[PDB]
Every structure is written in C-alpha cells, then in structure tokens.
Write a protein that binds this ligand. Structure first.
Ligand SMILES: *[C@@H]1O[C@H](CO)[C@@H](O[C@@H]2O[C@H](CO)[C@@H](O[C@@H]3O[C@H](CO)[C@@H](O)[C@H](O)[C@H]3NC(C)=O)[C@H](O)[C@H]2NC(C)=O)[C@H](O)[C@H]1NC(C)=O
Ligand SMILES: *[C@@H]1O[C@H](CO)[C@@H](O[C@@H]2O[C@H](CO)[C@@H](O[C@@H]3O[C@H](CO)[C@@H](O)[C@H](O)[C@@H]3O)[C@H](O)[C@H]2NC(C)=O)[C@H](O)[C@H]1NC(C)=O
Ligand code: NAG
Ligand code: NAG
Ligand code: NAG
Ligand code: NAG
Ligand code: NAG
Ligand code: NAG
Lengths: 116, 433, 123, 101, 116, 433, 125, 433
C-alpha cells in the first residue's frame, strides 16, 4: 500500500505513484513541521511547472554524466531506493536546471514579440 | 535528443530520520497521552526490502526515556514538597510481640512546625532504616537521607502510576519500519520488513535486573548483545517462555496524617499489623532451573566452553544490586542472589521496602512514597534477564540504566522519513503548446 | 491455657496502703506484656503495666500513690497503692490489656482477664 | 489523653451502634462489659471485627470517631461497649456505654 | 461580509465567494489550526481535480439514494442550508466518489501521456 | 443520466462550534485584553435566516469564566504572600476614634520578623471580625481566617482590577452570530439574525445577588430561564429600566505598613475616624416598588392566578446571602433582606466589609484586600436579579454561579464555524474530452 | 546571482532571479521555544497570504502572469522601453507605491468578472 | 499605449522591518545558542543598490539587549538563594598574614540555618565593604547592601558566562543587509551594500566607560553620534588601533562553603593572602597618549575650537563613574581618572572589587558572585570609548544604557522584510487561454 512495491523496479513501482505545556510545544512543533514539509514540496512542484501532477516532464535533458545508464536497465533493473542513491549527488543540479527552464518558459510567454 | 528529465511524485523512498513521535495512548499514564489509537492498524509487507536496524542506536529509545522522565516530573510537581521534615529525629527502637525488636524499623519523633507559625508539636512515625542516616555516631540523633542533597516531593496521593501499554505513532510524512526476522538479534540487515504507523504497545515498566511484563520472544532465546565478545556491554537475554513470579507484602500499614502546612499533610506509617517479614517474592524452582539452563545453552554458542558460572550481583546501591520494582505503588528491592548462583518446590527471595526513591537516579530530586494501607500481592511475568559478563566465564545480574528496558521492546522498530519526490530519465520531452 | 486467679487487697484498711497479685497458671511471669484492669465501680480501668521488660507503667490516675509491680515467680501480676481509699472500690481485674505494649508491629489479637475480686478497703 | 463516650441509649431488639469521638484516638478498638466482670472484644486491630465477635458485628474507627455496630438486634442488649486507645499517654479508656440497650 | 448574503437561491452564491505562556499556546494553536483547516480544504479540492477554482464539474452522477428530488426542486429553493443537512449523511459517499473519479482520470492521462 | 455533481467552494454554510475567542478593548484587564477593537465594525444582516440559540449551553460563558480566573491568577501571582502573618494574634475590641466600642475592627498584636530574619518584634493592626478566627472558647487569642488549610496572598496594590468593557472576537474561520429579537428568551429559535466579527463590550462585573452595570432589556422586562417551572433553576430577570444604587463607606481610614522580608510589606489597617456604620447603601422606594411591580406583571405570565411573595435568602455564607460589590479592596457584603420583602421616599441597607476573600470559591487561595485610605462612595446601575423560586409561590434573591452574571449578556451571541465546501446537482459531466 | 542577487539590475534583467527569491520564503527552551514557533508560524502565514492573493486573481501556480486590467497612465505614464530597461524593481516599487492595493482591487474585480463570465454563461462547453 | 498589468512573484524588493531573530553558536551562551553557525558564510554584493541605515534606531540592538537580559535571568534561576543571609553581621577588621588592616574587607560573623531546622551555626566570612551597609551609627551591626531592597541570589559555580561570538540570523522571509562603507558613520545612505544570512559574531562583552574586545574601525578613527551638536547623546568613538589593557588581582583567595538551608550552599571568602593593593589595570602611557591625540584630531573636525579638555566622570553611581568589567569571573570597578586629564613606561588604574551586583541596573535582582580562588589576570583589547560632551569645550567618560556597547557592533546591519509580489505593465493581455 503506502510503501507498496518499494522493493520493486522503478518501472513496476510507477503503479503506486497514485498512493500540558511541554506536550503543547511538541504538538505545535509536529504540526508546524508537517506544514512546512508540505509547503516545501508543493512550492517546488509549482516552481518547476509540475503543479497538480504525479508525472511531469520537462525541457531539461538528462546529462550523460548522471549515471551514464540506459533506460532499458534504469527502469527495469533498479528500484527507486537504488536509483535515488545512484544519482543523489546531482540532486541540486537537476533542481536548479528545472527551475531555470520553467522560468525561461514563463518569460517567453510574455514576450513583446509573438504572444499577441 | 533522447533522455529527458522526468519528475515523479509519490515515489516509495525513505531515509533514516529522527523526529518527535506521538505518545498517543487519575492515572498518570494517559493523563496527557489521551489520543485514541487506530482500532484497526494496518501492516504492510515490503517485498524484497532489506533494511539495517540497530537497537543500540535507536532514537526511539532515547526519546521514550525523555518522555518517561517528563511525565513523571509533571505528575509530581502539583503537590506537597516535604521541606519541613529536615529536622533532627529521635528514631528509637520499634518493638513488637514478645519483646522483639523489628530489624528494619525505627520509631522517629520530631518537632514539626505545624500550620500556625508559633507552634511546635511533637509528632512521630514509624520509618524504614533505608531512608535514615546516622548523625555523628553513638547517638540517638538521626536524619533522613535527603536534605544532604535536596527536598523530597511527596507522591501525589491520588495519582496512579500503574503502567498501561503506550503505542508510539509517527507524524504524517514519517513511518516506522518493523523488523520481522525471528532471530534478528539486535543489529544488522533485516529482510521481511513491514511498514506500520504505530508501535504494538509497550508498557513503561521500570524494573531492573529482571524485566517484567514485556513481550515474549517467539522463537529461540535471543542473547541480543551489542558486542558479545567485549565484556563491557549489557546483554539482554530475551526469553521465549515467561517465568511466573509472585511478590507479597504480608502486612497492613496503618496511617498517620501529619499536617505540615496550610493545606498540606505528610503521610507516614502508624503501626504495622501482620507478619514480621517486610516482604518476599517467590519463583517456582523447576521453572527457574530449566529457564536458566536454556539460557546457558544459547550462551554456549558464543562461549563454546563447558563452564558457565552465575554469581550474585556486585556491590553498590540497592537500585542496582537488587531487583527493584513498583508493586502496587510500593517499592521493593529483592535479593536475587538465590537465583543467580550456579555452575553449568519454589525459591523464596527476601525483599526490602524503601520509601524515599530516586528513580532514574537524577540525584537532584527524590520522591516519597506514602505508605499503603492493606496488604499487597503482585503477580508478574519475567520476560528477559539483564546480564553483564565478568572460557570459564562468569555472568552476573547486573545492568545499565533504564534505557535498556525499552531497548528490549523497541528493538524491532526504526523511524524513517518519506521523500516522495525524485527524478529519472525518460524518452518524452515536455510537450509545449 | 494461662488461667489466672482473682486478686484484691482483701480486708485492707481504709486510707491505708494496700496490695494484690493475680497468680497465672501456665505462664511466664515475664509473659510479654501484662497489666491491671481494675475497673472501678462504675468506671473505666486505669492503665498500668508490668511487662517482661521490667516495666512499671501507670496512668496519671495513679498519681504518686499507685504503681504497677513486678510479677511474682509464681507469675502473679502485681500492683500496689499507698493510702488506698475505701472510696476506690474496683473489680481488681488483671489482663493482657490493650495498650499494655508499644505494639509497633502487632499481629493477630490477644486478651486475658484472670478473674475479678472485691476491693472496697472498707474501715 | 482524650476520651469520649457513647452514653448508652441503645435500641433493644434492633440494629444499633455505640459510638465515640476522642480527639487523640488512634487505632481505637472496642470491647463490651456485657456480662460478669470483663469486657469481650468487639474489635481488635483497631476496627477489625474481633475474633469470635458476633457475625453481625461491625466497627468504624475514624480518627475522632468510632462506632460499634451490630445487626444482631438482640433483645435487652445491655452491652456496655467501650473505646480504648493509647492516645497521648498511658491509655485512654472511656467508660462509654453504660446499660446500652 | 462573511456569511453575508445567506439564504436565497443556490445561485445567489454569485461572486460572494471571495474567501504569557498559556496565552502564547492558545494563540499558536489558534493560528496553526486556521492554517491546517485551510490546507485540508485545499488538499481535498486538489484530490478531486479542483485547483484555483470556485466551481468544478465532475463525472460523478447523482444517486436516487442520496436525493430523489429533481433539478426544479434543488437550487430553486431559497436556501441550501437545509438541503446540506438533508444529504449530510451522504457527504462521505460523494466525496469518496469524487476522489475515485479523479483517480480514474489521472490513470487515463498517465497511460496516454502526450509527448513532444 | 442528466443528474451530475458540481463542487462549490465558499458557500455560506455554518455549523455550531466551540473555539477559542480572543479579547479586544495601569489595570489588569487592559494589560492582558490589550488588543484594540475594530472601530466602526461592520455588522451585517442575514435576510430570511432563523437560528437556534441556547444561553445555558453557550460555551462562551465557560470561556469567559476560565479567562477571568487565568487573568487574576497571573495578576496576583507576582506579589507579597502573607504566610508570615499566620501567628497567634492577641486581640481586644479597642478603637482608634470611638470613646466607646464599635463592635468590629479589633486591635490585634503579634510577633513578626522584619527585614532581618533574626529580628522579630511586636506589631499592631486592626481587623474585621469576618476575617478573624478564635482559637478556643473564651480565648483572647486568634488566627487569620483561611490560614488553617489555605494560603493567603495580598492583592497587588500596584494594579487595579477595573470592569473595563471587553469585546470577544472570532478567530479566522469563525463568525459570531447575534440574535436581534428584543424579547428573545435564549431558549430556542430567533428569526432575526445578524453577524459580527466581535461581540459588544461586556464589563466583567462581579456580583452575587443583583446584576449590575450591564445593558438594559429593550421592550419590557424579560424573564429568562432554562426551565421556568423547575424550582432547581435560576430565573434571570433582565430589567428594561435601571435603578440607581448608591453605596458608601463614610469613615476616614489610615494605613500602616509592616515590612516582611527583603523587599516585601503588608498593608495593614490603622486608625479609623468616623461614624459607627461601617457601610450602607441608598435605594429609593418609589423606583424599587415600581420595579418590583413591573417584574410581578411579567412573573404572572409564567405563574398566573396565584399570589407571590418576595422573601430574604435562606442562608449560607456571605457570598450566597448578601449582595457583593467591588468598589475597591474595601469589598462590600450588603444585606438586601429589607429590599426583598413584599407580597403581591428611600431606604437604607446596612452593609459590612471583609478583607480576606475566597473569590470564585477557590478557598485554597484567599486574597487579602489592602485597605483604602480616606472614605468611599460608589454607585451602580442595577439591571437585574438572579432570583430563584421555592396558592402562593416564594421568590428568594439567592446566590448563583458567577457565570450567571455573564449569560445575561452573552445570551444573544453564538459561535459558528464556517464550512465553505459542498456540492449541488447539475446536468453536466466534466469537460475534459 | 543569489538571494537578492542582482537586486540593482534592471527590472527586465531581474526577472531571471524570480526563482531564487521564491525559494527563500520557506525555511529548510520554554518562552524561547514559543518565540521560535511564533516566527515560523508567521512566516507560513505570510507565504499563504501571498499565495491566496495571487490565486484570487487567477495566477496560482505561476511566477509571471497577465490579466485583463489595462495599465492606466495615471499609474505610470512611461513606456515599456523606459521602465523595463533603465529602472530597478526597488525604484519602481517606490514610483507606483501610491496604487498599492488599487491595482489589487482591480485585479480582483477583473478576475471576478472573468469567473462570473465562465459561470453558467457558456458553461459545460 | 496598449499595455496591461502583469503580476510578478519573486520580485527582489524589500521593506524596513522588525522581526524575531534567532541566535546561532557549561557555557551559558553556547547552551542557549544551540543552533550551529554556517561553516561557510555567504555574502551577496548588491551591485548598483544603495540603502538607508540608522544605527540609533536599529531594532537589532534592542533585541540583542533583551535576549541578553533574558538569558542572564534564566541562567540564574536554578541556583542558590541567599535570602537566608539577611541577618545581622559583626564585620570586624580582617587579618591577612601579618596585615591587621585590610581596607577593602571585613570579617563578618553571623547566625545561619543549615540543612536542619535546628540550632543555627555560627559562621564567619569575609566580605568587601562595598557590599556591606552599617545598620546604625557607631555600631557593630551590619547587613548585606541589597537586603531590605530585593532578593539576592548566588550564581551557580558550574556556569560560565564567558562571551562567545553571537551570530544573529534572519528567519525565512527576511534578510539582513550589511553596510560596507568604512566611513559610514552611523546614519544615512550607504552606497555599498551586501546581504548576509547572519551577523559576523559579536561577543556580548559588558563594560562601561571603555569598550572591550570589539572590532576595530576599517579606516581611521570614527566618531559617531546621533547628533554632534546635541550634548544629550553618547558619542561613540571607534578606534582603528587597539590599546592593550592588563588587569590583575594579585592575591591567592581561599574559599569556603557554607551549607545554607536544605541542600543549598553559599560560597564565601575564607582568607586572602597576597599583595594587598587588591586590584589594578596596566595601560602603556605612550599608547594612551597616541590614542588620545588621534581621537582629538578627529574630534576637532566636529569641534573646530582649540583646547578641548578631557576630565574624569563628574560623579554619580559607581556603575557609571567607574570602569567596570568581568575579568576571569570576577567583577572589577577601576578608577579611570588618570586617563582623562588633558587637552592633547605605563600608568595604572587602582581598582576595586564587588560581589553583589545589580546588573543591568535592575534592582529587583542581585547576583552574588561566588569568590574565585587563587589569583586572576586577564588582558583585554580597548576598542572604542564611551564619551559625552558637557570656554572651549570639555568631555568626560560617559554613562550609557547598555545598548551603546552593542550599537557599536550592530551599526552596520539592518533587517528587511522580503516582499515578493508586485506588478508592472506589459505588451500582452491575458486573452482567452
Ligand atoms: C434585525 O436586526 C437588525 C440589526 O440589529 C435591525 O436593523 C437595525 O435597525 C436600527 C433601527 O431599528 C438601525 O439603527 C437606526 O436606524 C434609524 C432609521 O430611521 C436611524 O435614524 C438611526 O440613526 C440608526 N441608529 C444609529 C445609531 O445610527 C440599525 O442601523 C440597523 N442595523 C443593521 C446592521 O442594519 C433590524 O431592524 C431587525 N429586524 C427586526 C424584525 O427586528
Ligand atoms: C578579551 O579576550 C581575551 C582573549 O582574547 C579574554 O581572555 C581569556 O579569558 C578567559 C576567562 O578569563 C581565560 O580562560 C581561563 O583559562 C585558564 C587557563 O589559563 C583556565 O584554567 C580557566 O578555566 C579558563 O578557561 C583565557 O585563558 C583568557 N585568554 C588569554 C589569552 O589569556 C578576555 O577575558 C576578554 N575580555 C573581556 C572583557 O571579555
Ligand atoms: C428575503 O425575502 C424577500 C422577499 O421580498 C426577498 O426580496 C429577498 O431577496 C430575500 N433574501 C434572501 C437572502 O433570501
Ligand atoms: C468623603 O466625605 C466628604 C464629606 O464632605 C465628601 O465631600 C467626599 O466626596 C467623600 N469622598 C468619598 C470618596 O467618599
Ligand atoms: C551596474 O551598472 C553596470 C554599467 O555598465 C552594469 O554593467 C552592471 O551589470 C550593473 N549591475 C547590476 C547588478 O546589474
Ligand atoms: C486613471 O486613473 C485616475 C486615478 O484617479 C482615474 O480617475 C481615471 O478614471 C483613470 N482613467 C482610466 C481608468 O481610464
Ligand atoms: C575571622 O574570625 C574568626 C573567629 O574565630 C577567626 O578564626 C578567623 O581567622 C578570622 N579571619 C580573618 C581573615 O581575619
Ligand atoms: C546568634 O546571635 C547572638 C546575638 O547576641 C549571638 O550571641 C550568638 O552567638 C549567635 N549564634 C549563632 C549560631 O551565630
């Protein structure tokens, strides 16, 4: 269910993407933290132009240095846990590129040229 | 060009994490842990998932320790602080029956300040020697063991401390992974991992030496050491059969209420009516002997030599040398030397009773346990032994601090954070209209 | 088993010293606690004790005239009083009385009464 | 030491109780001089019913309060029930009830 | 004007649809809960397919079980408050169905991804 | 086939709800309930809306009570305690200005420490009989009332406790509905409902028998009760006309000061110059008689065709038998027995003064009210009664809960939660194909 | 380039840093604990108030959006080549500071009309 | 025309603001500022951005002040109370070795309660006379100076108050701007501005007349004032070169420990052996002369009149007239008159020691500084002076509100609120989409 297919390959696992004072302070910290995490993820999908989607594609190409593997092995012979570890050192690079692409698209949409 | 970045959300990936867990659910327990748990909790098996567990480094244990202390202190805070009792006491011979002297008791008289500030009154109560210190020497002047350090808070007379199971629950965004390997034994990779949101429910039992009313091992007895080879670690032997223990205090303590202030009173023993023995506990002999034999059978797998010796605990404070536990609100300190004495119908262990308690050490604080009227009997399950190790190996019923009692139950759980975002290459570039 | 005799200062003179003792059969003289329970005519008995502890306790009612006395080798509980008045008529009973001991850690229950006697000390 | 008295006035052939209220009472117990020249314990170990006490007997020592009750409802139950405790010094023995019922 | 223009036809909605220690704990709880309530409604609208919308048309039909009244009885009444009470016991059914409908739509789109 | 679901957000729907409201408005009330109000707040009217109000089930009164306790607790906490004064008091009925005996304000001497812990000396102060407890029969020795079993703390002389009007305001997501039906009882539906973000201001006036300084009823006198018929229920009477009550303490008091501890002192009553009456209240006859006749005309609609009698209260301590006023630390407990005496140009009620007060019935924490120098004159507007019932029926001006003094103004307000989501039928499917 | 990097750059040039500014709005023993929670809650409230404000005029989910509200020359009688080029956002904020909430009331109104015109009118199409 | 409104989010603009700042890293400062610092601080230069700074209106100083008071007060709460010491003292002349007269200290005998409510013990301790008040004329009776005022508490020996750099950090949604103009001089536009996540780290050093251990001016000596003409304000002179100051207490102090009350302990001076001059500070003469000369030359740019004279403080409270500081945990009050007597190898300042301190000028609390055993030396860096202006013109060491010593470090920082939303016109219209 919740983490169902966690040990399955990434391709297979795509099927589950659709799935008193001190006490007071701990409860407030837990609630505030949950909100902050929610908003950070929504903000990030928003800034990349993936708002409301589980599957989102972009205009950023995958770099040849980001594991240098083929799709026929990546999706079929690896799990998401393994994949996340395999490319973890490119996390910020990819996120930055996604933000740049989306911002450029938005700028193109309001150009004085075309648009009208 | 091919190989485009694709963003996915809802990805089944987690990382190790430390967070605040919910305690969830006249008794102190659940006085604040008042949130009903899921009546139908689910467990999800993760196929082909192997995780590394380490009970000795489990943050859940550390967090429980803090919750236990915090609840305890909050519970005791709103009631009388026993400060007017730092007085010189007479503590004379407590006598009974045919001119018998009670070995553990003294009749202490003192001048109490009363609620009206111009009065002083002579009051007296019957006290245990364990709570009293000799002043000077060759003298009738005595003092309580406190004052030397700090004041004692009287336990709030209307609060029960009887343990109930508590299920710790992860906050949304977090999950608890559970290890279901029958022979997992403390640390390392665990296959057959399942996901739960809340733990199975652990009673916050605070005994030492012999663990009481815990979960029972399902398979073979598990030794569960941090390092079996190095004799500097606690060994938590988890038994797969419970040993029955019964404890009795065969007497009625009467009570005298001494007013000590403007709305405050101190409770103390008046007279003791009943037997002379302060307390005792007993364990069936065949059960104990066989149980200990089963434990050595497994110890021999780590120590493959036919000479295992059990000896009584080392010297020190009663809190570490005896079997300390809470029995009906009473505090028992039982002598287990009769159990841990062997080389490889029942046994009765004498028990001491003490009223000024320093639970979890803490040092700067103490609690006074009011006398309890009526006689007390407790029946409980011995579910695991705490051993320390000293070819011809010797083991003793020693132990660590209270965290070890919870390590023995929380060993199968780990907290992780869920990270639903991730990326991977695809064949499709974003379609832009 | 420890049956005991009645006792009184029989034929005592009025306003004169008087004494009595209650021999107990099947008993140690030092049979743990022991006391008099000489309830006065129409009144409660005064406290007293002559325990195995070689006690000589008495209630304030005894003033400085009366006192508990050590039991005889015959295990006869004993007591005496100076200038006993004819006014102080009593049952002169002996007993394993309540408050005959500190009882810091009491057990079960016990009692004994020996037997009553006349104690008018008339004329 | 404190004392208090029941002062008899008990009902005959009816459930009834003797009572006391001595300020210094502690672990007080009852006995009654219902016959001859001796009191039989009604209670021992403070208020606990005495061994061989009437099955219908009960007691309620409660600091400066006491009772010696029975549902026995005997006729002419002129049991001179009384309270005693060591109290402050020596012992406090209240004559308490006289002719009771 | 919160809850202003109450009553009248359902269509009356128009465009009115436009929105020390103990003390510190009470105030933090009040603010945090206001945030949580806001976000839960936004999450619920999101799962049903409503994002940035006041009014959404879905693919969930009405059951005679919930209401056997017609379209000439509902809306035309000068209220909604009583009506919401009349079908309050089906709220969770309609809401569950709205989630199922969106899940099917998401699945249909997922398996028919439009690619450049 | 033509019946489809449409989802709507922001629809004006509300539900009964319980939440925390906040206050809006040299004294405690201003310090805590310091948030400003919206000037010229806009009230709106809900056309053709009927709603149910229930003043006896309205949790705002409970909230108000709790906040009052909370404020007084915070306010009194950082001030001088009087524990050091609970010493034997040597008292005589000596006077300061009276050549004879005033039968009150006794002159008590006592031994108290000063700024130095090793120095103790005799001090004198005058006390009210209501504040003094005799230690034994015919004894000259006394103790302060409420010392035995309870603490006494001085009221903070540095800050006032004024009945400033306070408005309660809704948190986001909530709205306050108000009933604008002038003859509404608080027992059912109101067919004219308006909505506000804040209630009108309510002055936190405390009284025990008669209701003071609130709003007046519009229209005729309104009699409000949870039941009317039940003799176990209080019937609040809300007058449409006020009656002036003028109370005074005509004598000139002075003060002395007893230093207690490093930076603390006790404010003690010294000499009193003036008349014999300690206090009294001025009520006109014509107004009172007319007021009762008007009340009777309305009682007759609930209790027709029978005679009624007004009688003095049945008994209990002052807090439930007399009319309490707070005109400063010189608290008044006035005898209204001569006011409520009738069957169906001015009068004076005798009145007493008390300084050690178990306000809110929190008897474990008595407050000492410091004396006020000079004389006191205070007036108030009576708005109602907390009168309780039991041919002929009897009406007794008995006491009641403190919450009864707030329900009389909060009866017209209700708190509801805004619930913006809902659905409605249409005849369309989603336009995504 | 960084948070407020290029703040002095032209209005146009600065549009390429919108993605940076947008990410620094959210974060990564007793009374003190309250001070910190209050700060965190308030930062969240500010974030959400701005998202609701942006969403109310139909721009949810975008860093850059347009509306149907015309630019009245009373607001700023300068052309695009004058403001997007030789002027910064800080200067601009001051230049039109008076119309704070004037523009927003207008944005809310135009969106209200846009939504009204899509409600019932030509709906289910 | 043909332009329409475009709405932008993420616009790099800000407004002046006041918000809550947080602090980043046995030491009280380290314990409180538990949050780690950025190991690699980043800075952004705001090329072509100018901004207005005003150090005298900078809300960061107020917050720093408040955080310090709060931490100080909290640190001292779980410690020994010395209120049991408000007793009569004998305070006779103390003897050190063969010195019968010690001007600064007296030998005070007293009556003190120990852990028991029993006969008090007679104890003796040495006290500085600056903290002792004589109770009457020609009398042997003495009291602690802060009794008959407020509670006196003892600092815990376990806690260090040694200043560590404190980094103030912005919360999300906020930023701190930093002024990089070497000659900024307190107020007005700064034409070279950069941003930081946190400040550079300021040690919270407490001093009066001279500022210690700050950062030196980047350029030449800077004289800062809210208003030069106005003689009612502090002039902060910020030096570009430091002056080395050595402070010593050349005596080996012997400490004792007196149990006070039920578990608490009072630390007190037993004996002092050494060079009984008690304390002094050593300042190079030529360094001071060069420093003063340079300051005056810069002063003359504000004050063109020749022969401006420097004088000693005019008088008033010790905390103002004398140079105070914490040296090794001890509290020094040094005489600076020798530093300010002109119109311009070493010199020394005689210096006194106190133990009871009304720090922060709040009389409601007083800290007793436990005595420190052995001898104390420290060397500090004089980095700026606190001066006030009063015929030519004259200057004296000034006083301050303990904000001045922090304004001198925070003058270059400003807090601003980020405002991401704004609008501008475009050529495009929404159209239909
Ligand atoms: C349902 O409740 C409404 C809210 O209380 C009532 O509306 C109020 O009526 C008042 C008059 O009855 C208005 O105030 C006064 O109106 C007169 C009109 O002639 C003016 O001259 C007065 O100057 C004005 N008073 C003041 C101080 O200005 C209230 O303004 C009005 N309130 C609102 C919010 O509209 C309804 O009348 C009531 N309906 C029923 C059946 O009782
Ligand atoms: C200004 O800065 C200097 C350092 O640059 C500070 O001097 C330092 O002061 C501390 C506390 O007095 C000294 O710590 C002590 O050291 C001894 C060992 O020598 C140890 O036994 C003690 O437990 C304690 O740790 C430190 O050594 C000393 N540094 C030097 C170089 O001497 C000075 O205190 C600061 N001035 C002000 C006003 O804050
Ligand atoms: C209330 O009824 C009147 C009847 O004339 C109508 O005009 C008005 O619009 C109705 N208002 C609401 C909110 O239903
Ligand atoms: C005190 O009495 C005088 C008598 O003339 C009166 O004028 C004054 O108002 C009274 N003051 C108070 C506060 O009662
Ligand atoms: C500042 O102005 C110069 C002018 O040549 C320009 O090159 C530089 O990019 C500007 N700085 C910023 C932040 O845009
Ligand atoms: C331009 O703005 C002014 C501002 O007062 C307004 O009066 C005028 O009508 C506006 N012109 C338009 C919107 O065409
Ligand atoms: C202080 O007085 C006591 C009195 O017994 C003496 O023993 C002690 O040496 C004196 N201390 C000093 C420093 O003079
Ligand atoms: C208490 O104070 C008295 C004052 O005369 C003095 O004589 C006595 O010695 C002191 N006792 C103690 C314990 O210091």
């Amino acid at each position: 269910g919740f983490l169902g297919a966690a040990g399955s390959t990434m391709g297979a696992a795509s099927m589950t993407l659709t799935v008193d004072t001190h006490w007071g302070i701990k409860q407030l910290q837990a609630r505030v933290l949950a909100v902050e995490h929610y908003l950070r993820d929504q903000q990030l999908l928003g800034i990349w132009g993936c708002s409301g989607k589980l599957i989102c594609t972009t205009n950023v190409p995958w770099n040849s240095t980001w594991s240098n593997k083929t799709l026929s092995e990546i999706w079929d012979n690896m799990t998401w846990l393994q994949w996340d570890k395999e490319i973890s050192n490119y996390t910020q690079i990819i996120y930055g590129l996604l933000e740049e692409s989306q911002n450029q698209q938005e700028k193109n949409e309001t150009d004085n040229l075309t648009c009208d | 060009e091919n190989l485009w970045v694709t963003v996915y959300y809802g990805v089944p990936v987690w990382k190790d994490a430390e967070t605040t867990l919910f305690c969830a659910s006249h008794n102190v327990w659940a006085t604040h842990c008042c949130v009903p748990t899921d009546p139908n909790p689910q467990e999800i098996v993760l196929e082909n998932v192997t995780e590394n567990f380490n009970m000795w480094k489990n943050n859940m244990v550390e967090q429980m320790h803090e919750d236990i202390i915090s609840l305890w202190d909050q519970s005791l805070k709103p009631c009388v602080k026993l400060t007017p009792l730092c007085v010189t006491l007479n503590c004379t011979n407590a006598t009974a029956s045919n001119s018998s002297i009670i070995e553990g008791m003294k009749n202490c008289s003192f001048n109490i300040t009363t609620e009206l500030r111009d009065k002083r009154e002579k009051k007296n109560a019957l006290f245990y020697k364990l709570d009293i210190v000799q002043l000077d020497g060759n003298s009738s002047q005595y003092r309580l063991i406190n004052c030397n350090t700090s004041a004692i808070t009287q336990a709030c007379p209307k609060v029960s401390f009887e343990p109930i199971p508590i299920h710790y629950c992860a906050p949304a965004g977090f999950a608890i992974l559970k290890c279901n390997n029958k022979t997992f034994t403390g640390t390392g990779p665990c296959n057959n991992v399942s996901t739960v949101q809340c733990t199975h429910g652990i009673k916050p039992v605070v005994s030492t030496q012999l663990l009481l009313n815990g979960s029972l091992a399902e398979g073979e007895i598990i030794i569960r050491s941090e390092n079996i080879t190095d004799n500097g670690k606690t060994i938590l032997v988890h038994l797969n059969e419970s040993v029955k223990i019964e404890c009795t205090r065969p007497n009625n303590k009467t009570r005298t209420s001494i007013r000590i202030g403007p709305g405050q009173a101190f409770y103390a023993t008046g007279q003791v009516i009943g037997d002379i023995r302060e307390a005792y506990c007993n364990i069936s002999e065949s059960t104990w002997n066989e149980t200990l034999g089963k434990v050595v059978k497994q110890l021999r797998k780590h120590f493959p030599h036919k000479n295992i010796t059990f000896q009584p605990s080392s010297g020190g404070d009663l809190e570490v040398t005896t079997h300390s536990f809470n029995c009906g609100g009473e505090f028992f300190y039982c002598n287990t030397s009769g159990l841990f004495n062997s080389t490889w119908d029942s046994i009765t262990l004498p028990c001491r009773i003490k009223q000024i308690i320093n639970m979890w050490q803490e040092v700067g604080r103490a609690m006074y346990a009011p006398p309890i009227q009526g006689n007390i009997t407790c029946v409980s399950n011995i579910t695991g032994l705490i051993l320390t190790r000293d070819n011809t190996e010797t083991f003793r019923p020693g132990g660590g601090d209270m965290r070890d009692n919870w390590r023995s139950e929380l060993y199968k759980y780990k907290v992780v954070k869920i990270e639903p975002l991730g990326v991977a290459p695809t064949a499709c570039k974003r379609r832009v209209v | 088993x420890x049956x005991x005799x009645x006792x009184x200062x029989x034929x005592x003179x009025x306003x004169x010293x008087x004494x009595x003792x209650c021999x107990x059969x099947x008993x140690x003289x030092x049979x743990x606690x022991x006391x008099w329970x000489x309830x006065x005519x129409x009144x409660x008995x005064x406290x007293x004790x002559x325990x195995x502890x070689x006690x000589x306790x008495x209630x304030x009612x005894x003033x400085x005239x009366x006192x508990x006395x050590x039991x005889x080798x015959x295990x006869x509980x004993x007591x005496x009083x100076x200038x006993x008045x004819x006014x102080x008529x009593x049952x002169x009973x002996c007993x394993x009385x309540x408050x005959x001991x500190x009882x810091x850690x009491x057990x079960x229950x016990x009692x004994x009464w020996x037997x009553x006697x006349x104690x008018x000390x008339x004329x």
